[PDB]
């Protein structure tokens, strides 16, 4: 399985576009958290299937598959959010029927913090002109690097090898192939940071029972 074919299978693992079935209208704190949690829950279902489509993932121990997903899920969601928002500066495209503005993030205490973080990282990927295939490798690495053991490192290395390949196809300088690789990877730190904050904020919302009970989301949030 060459880098190109591995990237192809990631493309084929891409989850489908999700909508929350919500008639267009202004947002409030009760409806925003409602939509954000409802969307996350649905995306979580598609994320599980996506992972299983990653060559070798289902070959890992059951203990590993669970710990990998339980720890990276929010990062993967936010990485998807950023790729969808890339061509819409100043906007967070959570879903076709859930587009948010920075000022709208003021309807919820503490979320404006997280939006700015997301908008910044997104803007960054925009400056770098993140390509789809890079997005596929990066997202895959987030799952595999958010820690049967050898199989994992083997898989992680394969995806890493796929990212380099994608960068090599752009036909840019070698020095620039290295600069780009590092800049794309250094951003994972910001996605992991906006993630930890998003979890903290979400966990806090749960403890207050301000958001409906989403079995899958609840389970992933607790551990």
């Amino acid at each position: 399985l060459s880098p190109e074919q591995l990237v192809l299978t990631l493309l084929e693992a891409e989850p489908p576009h999700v909508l929350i079935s919500r008639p267009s209208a202004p947002f409030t704190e009760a409806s925003m958290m409602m939509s954000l949690t409802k969307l996350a829950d649905k995306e979580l279902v598609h994320m599980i299937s996506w992972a299983k489509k990653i060559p070798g993932f289902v070959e890992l121990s059951l203990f590993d598959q669970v710990r990998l997903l339980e720890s990276c899920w929010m990062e993967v969601l936010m990485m998807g959010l950023m790729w969808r928002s890339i061509d819409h500066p100043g906007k967070l495209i959570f879903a076709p029927d859930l587009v948010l503005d920075r000022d709208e993030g003021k309807c919820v205490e503490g979320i404006l913090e997280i939006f700015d973080m997301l908008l910044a990282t997104t803007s960054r990927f925009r400056e770098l002109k993140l390509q789809h295939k890079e997005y596929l490798c990066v997202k895959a690495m987030i799952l595999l690097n958010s820690s049967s053991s050898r199989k994992l490192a083997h898989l992680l290395n394969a995806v890493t090898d796929a990212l380099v390949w994608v960068i090599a196809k752009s036909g840019i300088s070698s020095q620039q192939q290295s600069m780009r690789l590092a800049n794309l990877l250094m951003l994972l730190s910001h996605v992991r940071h906006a993630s930890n904050k998003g979890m903290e904020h979400l966990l806090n919302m749960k403890c207050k029972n301000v958001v409906p009970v989403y079995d899958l989301l609840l389970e992933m949030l607790n551990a």
Binding site: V66, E70, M220
Partner: peptide
Amino acid sequence: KLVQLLTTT
């Protein structure tokens, strides 16, 4: 939930 989806298609 997470485990059953990991063991079914």
